[PDB]
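Researcher: Last one for today. Full complex below.
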Amino acid sequence: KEMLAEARARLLNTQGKKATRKIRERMLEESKRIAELQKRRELKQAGINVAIKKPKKKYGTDIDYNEDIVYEQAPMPGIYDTSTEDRQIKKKFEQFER
Amino acid sequence: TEPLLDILVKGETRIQNRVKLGLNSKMPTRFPPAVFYTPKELGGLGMISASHILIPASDLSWSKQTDTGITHFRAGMTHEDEKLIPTIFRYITTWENEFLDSQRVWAEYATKRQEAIQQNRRLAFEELEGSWDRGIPRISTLFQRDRHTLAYDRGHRIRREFKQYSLERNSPFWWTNSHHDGKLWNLNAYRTDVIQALGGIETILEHTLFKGTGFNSWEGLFWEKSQIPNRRFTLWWSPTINRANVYVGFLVQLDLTGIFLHGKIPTLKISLIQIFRAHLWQKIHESIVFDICQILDGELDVLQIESVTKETVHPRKSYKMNSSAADITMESVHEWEVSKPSLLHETNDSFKGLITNKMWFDVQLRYGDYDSHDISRYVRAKFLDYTTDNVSMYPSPTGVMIGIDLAYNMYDAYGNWFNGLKPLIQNSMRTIMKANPALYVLRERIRKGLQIYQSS
Amino acid sequence: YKDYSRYQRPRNVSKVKSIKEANEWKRQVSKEIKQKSTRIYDPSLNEMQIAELNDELNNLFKEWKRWQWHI
RNA sequence: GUGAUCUAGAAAGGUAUGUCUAAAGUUACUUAUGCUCUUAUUUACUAACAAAAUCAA
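Model: Here's the assembly. Have a good evening.
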């Protein structure tokens, strides 16, 4: 049965080193993130505001996707005059940020 | 067969190239045939030479059409020194000789056996000793211990041949069974003859670090382990591998010591850093300077000195081969007449040349190669160069220079002598080269790296 | 030079030297204060481990008191 | 009773790799172990070190 308990566990574990390590690094990265967020909340409990640090650039031209429209492929200019519709998204999107 | 002889040459050179590729050098001068062909008892590979042979190169066109004969010899294996190395075809008696021997011997065995039958007696075992290892089944098989159970073994030629379909490996003597045929060949004469083909054991040990260990004779050394490792091999033949007769090679002067490496031999560099560690070169040079100066003012009245002085040695000086300076400086009660500069074991001089107050002593340690291990040439060359040099700071144009070869534990002094120095200083250098503890750490550690232990 | 990133605490606070020197030993506490404070709130679930880590925090924070006390 | 003379040593080949480093603020007086130089023996880790082949008893 101990041979069978070893065989039952080996047949049901399919990943290898690289996937299990990627899982572990992903859990530890989120645990670091959850810790850093509650820090800012506990400092906000004291009223002192500390901003979240951005991730460090790995290479030179690394993109802050949050900073801008990433590769802004605007839609092709059409005829049906989307003028009132842009005003209502902007009013709705500013309402959502509020 | 001509192309077999070419392939023997091509194989043996390629395996010698394989050992040469074990280091980073395919130099001829680094690899004399004493490296490859001396037996394992003396520290070589123990290769068997078969291709130091003049090869018959007689006239390729018309050789296909007549069998011209042998009219021209091509040199098979050529080295810088022409040591004549025996080849084992001379050591194996030929088949027609072995077979014609066997017709007579088994006839002579048959007659002597019939004489044991008629005289109704057991065989003598010493009457037959004259033909003991003789005959193609090898008469020794008749008197084997397990001969009664080998007799049932039949079909053993064929079973040995079909081992090649059962076994992953080969047994290349597939045509002999040593239990049925005995031993058919002996190569014990090849070991002795290669030893005296390289000039004898003493000429071989000139190529080695055997003088560096401090041992007197060879007869009390077994060997530590039947395979010698690669670091022990490249440190055993190391004065030939790091020699000054190299074709090309960039001089580097090690790091803390005075050994020069011609190029990069990375296995030999590792061993010599372990031999010279914790600043052993300075510790050796300080220990000799400390020992002479004690012996000098030991006879301070007879040698008639005022005082001995250690000039304070820069610790880089002891391995600086470019130029040197004075180590020990002599002050005289009254003024000394120093003779012409002469050798340590020179007989006698006319003292009446020059009268000088202040003398000096300098110590030069060197690590000898196979090229330059004569110190007496070396020490006089360093002496004339430095005394003519205006860079080398001496107190006066006086003094002796005391040279020591560490790789061969030799010593000589070349310089001027006032009276009473030379039977004193020779007795001191006998005692110093046998009793210096720093030189004992040198000798012992080399014995550890070379793994050679006395008969003890 | 000489980094202050190599050596130990050093153990006694009163034996430390001039004020421009203990300033850098003091920030040589505060970083590990910052590092292991971030290691408090983590959901990594080892309750025994974060208890001994909590004691190390209280130890280093008492040292931080002592380095301020010397100044 | 002569001669013809090949070579040639350096790199990558030994290690991963990755992450972190509020000091400098962006307008609403609690005080608690200082690892010593050499030699020998024993234990643990470690070299991802090495190794009986033909053959002779």
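Residues 303 and 421 of chain B are 7 Å apart (CA to CA). DSSP finds 18 helices and twelve strands in chain B.
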